[PDB]
T-cell receptor
Framework: DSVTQKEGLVTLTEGLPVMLNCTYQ???????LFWYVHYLNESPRLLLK?????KRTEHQGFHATLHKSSSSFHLHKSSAQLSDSALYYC???????????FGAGTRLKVIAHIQNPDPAVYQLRDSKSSDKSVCLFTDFDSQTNVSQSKDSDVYITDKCVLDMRSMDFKSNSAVAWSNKSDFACANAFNNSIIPEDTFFPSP | TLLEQNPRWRLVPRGQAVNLRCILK??????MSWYQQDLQKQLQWLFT????????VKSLPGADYLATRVTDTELRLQVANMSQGRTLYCTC??????????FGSGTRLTVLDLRNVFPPEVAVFEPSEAEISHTQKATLVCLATGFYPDHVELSWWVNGKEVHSGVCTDPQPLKEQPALNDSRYALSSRLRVSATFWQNPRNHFRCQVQFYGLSENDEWTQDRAKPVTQIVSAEAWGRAD
């Protein structure tokens, strides 16, 4: 009658192993366990499933083994990939029920390994009005953290991880902008929050 | 596709109601259900109605529900007295248990004041010459700003074809005023291409933002454009070196 996913968020660098915990409780002998994956702007869909004690089940590098003795069905993958970032639900179906019980979900955030960081802050002009611009902080390693702005009329986005088969193009970036006429890119990406070697050209 | 679920989105004013419909396209999966997903992303079963004429009601925080199995292939849901948004999924399975559960495309419901709905303004920002010089790459940035509620889909189109390689779009919009419970939102996206591709003035780049807004059925009485579901785009052509 219950499904527990003890971790709400897992952040992990690509290439490292995935372990998403799931335990359950049921009085039923006929109990069916599932993992569902939920990508952005898609509906939940089956990842894998099993009712067989100690049988490894696998789908596209993900695998799980039901262990009835520890009421567990942990989701594993040897090497995380950026395309694995998603919400993952563990679920339970019992023969006496029409409902499936879903755990609270675990968000998996896979972050990039940046072999050759080249941190830089660039200023980009609006294609329609040379008045408006945005600031682009890019090519920094995944240890660099981008915090929200303190200023009310300054907007700063979270880091976005661009997944690319070409190593050269795999890169992190954040964007900042403001309607204030006082605004300069260094007001958003100041020297204390960007790496010392940031390439920071004058606009 | 096993299920057709409609509508895909609706803005519902507080206390009002909306009808959802799910059509089963394959009789081998006759076990039809409704699930909700709350704003904390928790999925919860609501109803499984197997026989034509079956009807049942249920109340959860934020919505009253009335579900009907109308025919062997039609399941309906009325969501009423709404006070909080949620996503509803029709599901189907071959047996009542022990089989794969299949999810329909879903219905996202948002509860708000219709007079506060605003489509995005959209702008494309051209790659920095310094980035091109420093990296031999060119990042275009798209900004969607001032929209409410937060349900947009952003896509990039290069020479008339949607592209995915090189695209990074914020997973969540940001609140322009995080202290307001009805702040408008912004969303950013990047499209990164080779410098030589951007430097070709024959190449055309477009950022497209699909906004989900009011229905034509909602009466609008304000002196600004009616903020119905619509596409807002911005574009740029490549620029030679």
């Amino acid at each position: 009658d219950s499904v527990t996913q003890k971790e709400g968020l897992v952040t992990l660098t690509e290439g490292l192993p995935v372990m998403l915990n799931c335990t359950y409780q049921t009085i039923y002998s006929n109990a069916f366990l599932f993992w569902y994956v939920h990508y952005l702007n898609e509906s939940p869909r089956l990842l894998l499933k099993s009712s067989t004690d100690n049988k490894r089940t696998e789908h596209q590098g993900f695998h799980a083994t039901l262990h009835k003795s520890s009421s567990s069905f942990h989701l594993h993958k040897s090497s995380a990939q950026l395309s694995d970032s998603a919400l993952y639900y563990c679920a339970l179906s019992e023969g006496g029920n029409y409902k499936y019980v879903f755990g609270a979900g675990t968000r998996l955030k896979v972050i990039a390994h940046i072999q050759n960081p080249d941190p830089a802050v660039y200023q980009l002009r609006d294609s329609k009005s040379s008045d408006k611009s945005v600031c682009l902080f890019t090519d920094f390693d995944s240890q660099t953290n981008v915090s929200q702005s303190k200023d009310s009329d300054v907007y700063i986005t979270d880091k976005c991880v661009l997944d690319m088969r070409s190593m050269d193009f795999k890169s992190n970036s954040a964007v900042a902008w403001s309607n204030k006429s006082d605004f300069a890119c260094a007001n958003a990406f100041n020297n204390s929050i960007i790496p010392e070697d940031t390439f920071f050209p004058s606009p | 596709t096993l299920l057709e679920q409609n509508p895909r989105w609706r803005l519902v004013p507080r206390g009002q109601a909306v009808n959802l419909r799910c059509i089963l396209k394959n009789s081998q999966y006759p076990w039809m259900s409704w699930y909700q997903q709350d704003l904390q992303k928790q999925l919860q079963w609501l109803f499984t109605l197997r026989s034509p004429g079956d009807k049942e009601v249920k109340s959860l925080p934020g919505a009253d529900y009335l579900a009907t199995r109308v025919t062997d292939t039609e399941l309906r849901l009325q969501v009423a007295n709404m006070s909080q948004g949620r996503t509803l999924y029709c599901t189907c399975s071959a047996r009542h248990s022990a089989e794969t559960l299949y999810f329909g495309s879903g219905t996202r419901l948002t509860v708000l004041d219709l007079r506060n709905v605003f489509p995005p303004e959209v702008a494309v920002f051209e790659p920095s010459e310094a980035e091109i010089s420093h990296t031999q790459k060119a990042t275009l940035v798209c900004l969607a700003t001032g929209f409410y509620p937060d349900h947009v889909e952003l896509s990039w189109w290069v020479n008339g074809k949607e592209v995915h390689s090189g695209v990074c779009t914020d997973p969540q919009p940001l609140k322009e005023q995080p202290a307001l419970n009805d702040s408008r939102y912004a969303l950013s996206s990047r499209l990164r291409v080779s410098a030589t591709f951007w430097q070709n003035p024959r190449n055309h780049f477009r950022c497209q933002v699909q906004f989900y807004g009011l229905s034509e059925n909602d009466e609008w009485t304000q002196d600004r454009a009616k903020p119905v579901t619509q596409i807002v785009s911005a574009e740029a052509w490549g620029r030679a070196d």
